[PDB]
Design an enzyme around this catalytic site. Sequence first.
Site, PDB file in Angstrom:
ATOM      1  N   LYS D 157      47.321  29.024  27.875  1.00  0.00           N
ATOM      2  CA  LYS D 157      46.349  28.797  27.550  1.00  0.00           C
ATOM      3  C   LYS D 157      45.320  29.776  27.701  1.00  0.00           C
ATOM      4  CE  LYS D 157      44.840  23.927  29.874  1.00  0.00           C
ATOM      5  NZ  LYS D 157      45.166  24.343  31.639  1.00  0.00           N
ATOM      6  N   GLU D 183      38.793  27.920  36.831  1.00  0.00           N
ATOM      7  CA  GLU D 183      39.224  28.432  36.481  1.00  0.00           C
ATOM      8  C   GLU D 183      39.869  28.939  37.935  1.00  0.00           C
ATOM      9  OE1 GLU D 183      42.272  27.781  34.746  1.00  0.00           O
ATOM     10  OE2 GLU D 183      40.535  26.358  34.728  1.00  0.00           O
ATOM     11  N   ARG D 184      40.726  29.954  38.107  1.00  0.00           N
ATOM     12  CA  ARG D 184      41.234  30.719  39.140  1.00  0.00           C
ATOM     13  C   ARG D 184      40.264  31.524  39.836  1.00  0.00           C
ATOM     14  NH1 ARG D 184      46.430  29.738  36.351  1.00  0.00           N
ATOM     15  NH2 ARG D 184      47.686  28.053  37.683  1.00  0.00           N
TER      16      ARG D 184
HETATM   17  N1  LIG Z   1      52.394  34.328  26.209  1.00  0.00           N
HETATM   18  C1  LIG Z   1      52.834  34.078  26.802  1.00  0.00           C
HETATM   19  N2  LIG Z   1      53.935  35.133  27.034  1.00  0.00           N
HETATM   20  C2  LIG Z   1      55.123  34.841  27.705  1.00  0.00           C
HETATM   21  N3  LIG Z   1      54.889  33.635  28.627  1.00  0.00           N
HETATM   22  C3  LIG Z   1      54.206  33.361  28.888  1.00  0.00           C
HETATM   23  C4  LIG Z   1      52.422  33.367  27.697  1.00  0.00           C
HETATM   24  N4  LIG Z   1      52.057  32.165  27.948  1.00  0.00           N
HETATM   25  C5  LIG Z   1      51.880  31.702  28.756  1.00  0.00           C
HETATM   26  N5  LIG Z   1      53.119  31.876  29.446  1.00  0.00           N
HETATM   27  C6  LIG Z   1      54.276  31.636  30.935  1.00  0.00           C
HETATM   28  O1  LIG Z   1      53.450  30.279  31.136  1.00  0.00           O
HETATM   29  C7  LIG Z   1      52.461  30.853  32.584  1.00  0.00           C
HETATM   30  C8  LIG Z   1      50.679  29.971  32.517  1.00  0.00           C
HETATM   31  O2  LIG Z   1      50.192  30.585  32.775  1.00  0.00           O
HETATM   32  P1  LIG Z   1      48.605  30.781  32.474  1.00  0.00           P
HETATM   33  O3  LIG Z   1      48.127  30.591  30.816  1.00  0.00           O
HETATM   34  O4  LIG Z   1      47.235  31.129  33.278  1.00  0.00           O
HETATM   35  O5  LIG Z   1      48.681  29.171  32.703  1.00  0.00           O
HETATM   36  P2  LIG Z   1      47.717  28.288  32.394  1.00  0.00           P
HETATM   37  O6  LIG Z   1      48.219  27.037  30.371  1.00  0.00           O
HETATM   38  O7  LIG Z   1      47.334  26.498  32.764  1.00  0.00           O
HETATM   39  O8  LIG Z   1      46.287  28.346  31.847  1.00  0.00           O
HETATM   40  C9  LIG Z   1      52.642  32.104  32.693  1.00  0.00           C
HETATM   41  O9  LIG Z   1      52.818  32.350  33.839  1.00  0.00           O
HETATM   42  C10 LIG Z   1      54.639  32.537  31.583  1.00  0.00           C
HETATM   43  O10 LIG Z   1      55.050  32.241  32.752  1.00  0.00           O
HETATM   44 MG   LIG Z   2      43.924  28.241  33.710  1.00  0.00          MG
END
Ligand SMILES: Nc1ncnc2c1ncn2[C@@H]1O[C@H](COP(=O)(O)OP(=O)(O)O)[C@@H](O)[C@H]1O
Ligand SMILES: [Mg+2]
Lengths: 380, 383, 113, 438
Positions: D157, D183-184
């Site tokens: 997200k 968030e972080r």
């Molecule tokens: N667009 C993307 N392309 C490749 N890997 C992705 C993508 N979005 C998320 N990921 C993977 O999933 C993880 C989700 O990270 P992040 O988006 O920060 O988490 P959250 O949804 O909890 O905020 C990433 O560290 C990566 O490993």
């Molecule tokens: Mg997040």
Amino acid sequence: KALDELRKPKFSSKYLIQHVSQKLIPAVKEWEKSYQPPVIHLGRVLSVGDGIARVYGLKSVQAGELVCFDSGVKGMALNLQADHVGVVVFGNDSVIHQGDLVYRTGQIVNVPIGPGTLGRVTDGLGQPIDGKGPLTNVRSSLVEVKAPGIIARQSVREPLFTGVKAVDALVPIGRGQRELIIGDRQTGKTAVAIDAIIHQKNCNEQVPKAQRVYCVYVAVGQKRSTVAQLVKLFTQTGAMRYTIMVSATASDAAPLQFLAPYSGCAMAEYFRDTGKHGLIIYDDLSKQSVAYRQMSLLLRRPPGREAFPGDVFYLHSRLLERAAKLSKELGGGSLTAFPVIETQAGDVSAYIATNVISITDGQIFLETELFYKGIRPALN
Amino acid sequence: ADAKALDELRKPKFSSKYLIQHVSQKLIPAVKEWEKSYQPPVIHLGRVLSVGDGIARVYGLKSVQAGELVCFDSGVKGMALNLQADHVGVVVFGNDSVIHQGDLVYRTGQIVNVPIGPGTLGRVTDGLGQPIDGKGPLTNVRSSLVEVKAPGIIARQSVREPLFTGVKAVDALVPIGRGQRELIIGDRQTGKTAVAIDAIIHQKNCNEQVPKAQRVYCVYVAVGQKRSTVAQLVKLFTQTGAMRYTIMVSATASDAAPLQFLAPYSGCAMAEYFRDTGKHGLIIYDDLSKQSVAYRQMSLLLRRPPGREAFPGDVFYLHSRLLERAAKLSKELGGGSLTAFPVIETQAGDVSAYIATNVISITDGQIFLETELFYKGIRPALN
Amino acid sequence: LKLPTAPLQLSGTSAQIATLLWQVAAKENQLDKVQDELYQFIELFKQHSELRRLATDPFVPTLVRTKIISSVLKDSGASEITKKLFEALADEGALSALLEVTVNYEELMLAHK
Amino acid sequence: PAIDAGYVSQVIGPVVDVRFDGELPSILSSLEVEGHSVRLVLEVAQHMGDNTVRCIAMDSTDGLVRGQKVVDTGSPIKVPVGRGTLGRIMNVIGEPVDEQGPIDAADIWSIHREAPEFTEQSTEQEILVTGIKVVDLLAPYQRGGKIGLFGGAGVGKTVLIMELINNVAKAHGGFSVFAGVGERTREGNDLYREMIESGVIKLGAERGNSKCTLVYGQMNEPPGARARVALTGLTVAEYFRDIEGQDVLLFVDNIFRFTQANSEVSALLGRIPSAVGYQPTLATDLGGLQERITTTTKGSITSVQAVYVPADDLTDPAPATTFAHLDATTVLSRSIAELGIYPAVDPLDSTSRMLNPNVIGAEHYNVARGVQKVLQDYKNLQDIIAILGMDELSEEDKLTVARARKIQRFLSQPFQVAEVFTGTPGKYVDLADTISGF
Ligand SMILES: Nc1ncnc2c1ncn2[C@@H]1O[C@H](COP(=O)(O)OP(=O)(O)O)[C@@H](O)[C@H]1O
Ligand SMILES: [Mg+2]
Ligand SMILES: Nc1ncnc2c1ncn2[C@@H]1O[C@H](COP(=O)(O)OP(=O)(O)OP(=O)(O)O)[C@@H](O)[C@H]1O
Ligand SMILES: Nc1ncnc2c1ncn2[C@@H]1O[C@H](COP(=O)(O)OP(=O)(O)OP(=O)(O)O)[C@@H](O)[C@H]1O
Ligand SMILES: [Mg+2]
Ligand SMILES: [Mg+2]
């Protein structure tokens, strides 16, 4: 007619008799000989039970202040109420009675931090348990510090070598990162965390002085035998020279297991705030949340999902945001966290598991199927 | 501690008068020394003890009725819901940031009422009857209670007139009637409102075709929706011409919880004008699953004990007394009708939810809309 | 520290006030001098609508009510047990508990004799 | 001087009760505690009776004694608003936390408002292309609408909302606002250093040419700060919408932390809990905040909000309440991400009000409904293919499986913000290239 409104009374302050008895015993002509209940910096226990003591008085106590009972067991002023003080006890509550004197220490809940904590096994409150005397070259800092902000941090640039091949190649970890070690029971969670501490002993003898990594291992809810078998490992390797060991075991009280990550982080924040590099490991991160669920339900707070409180995200988000890579105008020191979460039947959609995944930067999923197929470390 | 010797204490037994003779001449100069801080005593007016989260606990108000409109001194209206022995729990019709402790509360004398009549026909009102469309106040209108009881057995007759909706998945398989209460139930974004909007649009096509007495006057009740969705819907009703016969009651998501709770009853009282005068009404309680959440917020903050999914115990009676007002009256009562389309949103298709199973047992029919038939091209997604 | 034993054990939050009032007045030998002062203040609530307003009206502030009573209860030959009890009930809004401290004092007194 | 100064009555965590002897502050009014270690702002939440108010602290309450002087400011929390907030980081109470000096405010606006009225609502459904194939085809984004990204802790997200900053904020002519709610803090420093090198945020004398205002109430803050920092982020965006007349972008990284932090204080406000453990005022707290983020007749706010689903439960009452406040939902799935398909958007759970043939054209609409038709038909076969394999299907259904296995790889797309950790460069896909490709 006019007395119909007084035929049953209405009042707040459940401890009504305690305020009246502080006003009627000075009306006795004999008990004006300084027969005074101390209420400004002292207090009497009203109720005590399941790790919560209600304390009358303590009118000058701060919120979050470490208070001390007359038994010697210390506590924390958690709820400051209009007529009493709710105190969570940092020991066994069987040595606290009704009418025991509670003394305030004058300061917020603090642990000894500094270079004298290296080599020492420590409980969740700061006092050593290894039987080597008190902490000597040390100073007291708070366990509850606000994490460094946005300007106080910088990008994670330097690598933290774990010594594990499946980690250092595939899931690379930098200084200042928070990396979750998540998996089932007996899947190699510690096998990864304590290989990192041992590998820092090998690397600290080859890097310069300002590049060494000082480790802190917090053991929340573990067996005391496995903590004792781990100090023997860190002593026969030599890793104990750079390691602090905080341990609130399974027989310790639930406020001691709640506070042992925050105690060990403050001992690890000494190295981060002085330009050195720290490595903090919260073994069994879920455990602490179970010990915090115990305190929350015994405080009769409304439970949420899986009977956890609403601030069980804030329990781990406040703790893990203190692992940061600081900017160059703050020494440039770092702190690397390795929280450990035990999952049940490999379910990572649990409440505490998805909490710490949405806090930490990456994860190390240790699969239980690869661990029993001989693939160790069983990195998914 | 028994009340026999306690009421015996009403009789004088003082046997000395060295305080009664002393302080009686000392009390009135002592009361008069602190009379700057004395608020004046209150009997038939009210005074706010505590206010918070849309609930005011009001001291005084001796002669208020239960369910009565009260008015704070800042102009915001209220409703005396639970009359307790020492105070009155008032739900605030608006923002409770203008209410302080010690504000005077005024009894208005009337049970809660909305403007009903032909003047509401074409207007966008809130959950209490005040027009929010910016077209001035309501003219050619009169006040009527929002808590009229439903017509009984002798007042009704059998449902015989059709009231087509214009959706042939409905009108062929699940035929609606003229006084029938039919539930439109489904998950989120399965076409619940669509089935109800196509019913209102189809009445405008039929009202220009039938002789003056089979005409159907629609009422759309938008509970808990966002305000831009409602404005997107008046734009559709004005460009179609359906707004000539449509009233819109909209207690949106920014409104207070007693406004969204009362907007199905406010809209039903406006639609009961056509039922009680020989015309035919059609009411859509869109997001009736959001009225029960608004009613749950009031009762949990009035400290009524929670039940299934923390809902009140009488949350069946919340919807049963609302929907039973949709009837087909007898010839001695005009022959008018009122047909209801409540909308309940389920969670992941769970029909076994608490509010969902109540309205299924109250309403006559159901229009089930499944999210897996919706993505197979079947629109409307009628199961 | 040592208080005399009450003649009987009683209920909570208005009978243990009268129990404490009995144990304090027995240390001063002032039982029947503080017993009739209870019925005197009861007559004072039957007379004045401004003295029972401090017991029942929730809008009288807690600093006004303790300064009506303590400025009415200057010395006047009244007991120091009465002048320190009724300002403890005024400091906490417990002046309406006077009608049950008195009943529970009546049962403590006849059990004493 | 003794009046207009209350003293702390009792402290229960983040909830502080203050007793005012003379006159009580209004609800939502802001207070100041004298003699704290930091600037502790309390916001009055409830009048409890007996001359006590109930407040929520904006910082930590550790070190509070129950006699401390609390001063009423006579107003709610007022934050600096205007073009002087561009390129600056503010916290919940409007203090600059970017160490760039004080904020040159055009005005000091309260963070508490009523929603804009029914007559001030705009009905203009214009598309906003994002360059993402699963977004531009199946759930297109409105140019002045509310957009939700629903996610389950690790499904992507934040990488999706950073790609939306990478794609539509550079092509936008107006001002962006980022409300980092819960968030972080590492991500707030990552976004700040990325927006400085990109020239979105300029420091020093060139600060007036910045196009973004950061408001950060991250997850190291107490629940009082995380419950009102979304209201601070709207107030900067509401000034550009109302006063400046601009088209505003508002990015709210996890709006669920507004709902979660209101549940951490509601246990101590003495309320009976609602369903699973949230506050009884869930729908009216979220509905009071989300109704202020609208396109009005004098300005548009294109808001993109991330929504965290708490244990991958979409039926949880905090994500379920948010679904009714949005024009386009983008539900991301944990099971799509385990296939390696990124962005992990569920095509049969993401909806939009723009997916209507009278808005996007009948040629774009018929393709999206055809993509959703064979993806639903592949989901109907998911257990026959599991327990019996693909050899038992029809020859007209094995064509359905092979086509749907192709488009769910073709909904995947590499991002320009994911090129750092995946290595593959990002791909911006035009709208006509997606309809023709599908
Ligand atoms: N667009 C993307 N392309 C490749 N890997 C992705 C993508 N979005 C998320 N990921 C993977 O999933 C993880 C989700 O990270 P992040 O988006 O920060 O988490 P959250 O949804 O909890 O905020 C990433 O560290 C990566 O490993
Ligand atoms: Mg997040
Ligand atoms: N790389 C490895 N090679 C061989 N054995 C290993 C390896 N890593 C761990 N083990 C063994 O696997 C077992 C698991 O113990 P370990 O403490 O690592 O697991 P854990 O996940 O912490 O378990 P618990 O839930 O009981 O704390 C131990 O016997 C340990 O010695
Ligand atoms: N018959 C239909 N043909 C095509 N599209 C339709 C049809 N019915 C509904 N839709 C579309 O489906 C979507 C959802 O419809 P609708 O708004 O009625 O759903 P809802 O259940 O009220 O959703 P929400 O929970 O968001 O209020 C909209 O994009 C709408 O245009
Ligand atoms: Mg272990
Ligand atoms: Mg709808």
